[PDB]
């Protein structure tokens, strides 16, 4: 249609950065499945590069606002108030992802940052 670049189910599947979601639950309220932290964070970096800089940061948005599928099903939008972790904490840790605080690995901008650029300078 317009800006539909980057394939979804292939390269950028539905429910992206799932290990990052549970990683917020543990790093914030010490809650989450029984695993290690450096291991979860490592999984986020594998999903960070697997997701090419093209449409990269977009997925994070798909998690907050949620995405729709061609079949008519919805996914993501799981960022909710967990027992001891309100949407507020997930929103504070949410950013600083593509920056040197999570899995930056450089973006399309060839620098530590994405979106929120000059403000629609196209």
Swiss-Prot record:
A single GO cellular-component term on record: extracellular region
Disulfide-bonded cysteines: 6-55, 20-44, 29-85, 45-103, 57-114
CDD domains the UniProt entry points to: AAI_SS (cd00261)
Keyword annotations of the record: Alpha-amylase inhibitor, Disulfide bond, Protease inhibitor, Secreted, Serine protease inhibitor
Single GO MF annotation: alpha-amylase inhibitor activity
Tissue note: Seeds.
Residue runs in coiled coils: none
InterPro entries, alphabetized: Allergen/soft/tryp_amyl_inhib, Allergen/tryp_amyl_inhib_CS, Bifun_inhib/LTP/seed_sf, Bifunc_inhib/LTP/seed_store
Subcellular location: Secreted
Source organism superkingdom: Eukaryota
Main location: secreted
Family matches, as Pfam families: Tryp_alpha_amyl
Role this protein plays: May play a protective role against endo- and exogenous hydrolytic activities in the Ragi seeds.
Family named by the database record: Belongs to the protease inhibitor I6 (cereal trypsin/alpha-amylase inhibitor) family.
Name of the protein in question: Alpha-amylase/trypsin inhibitor
Organism: Eleusine coracana (Indian finger millet)
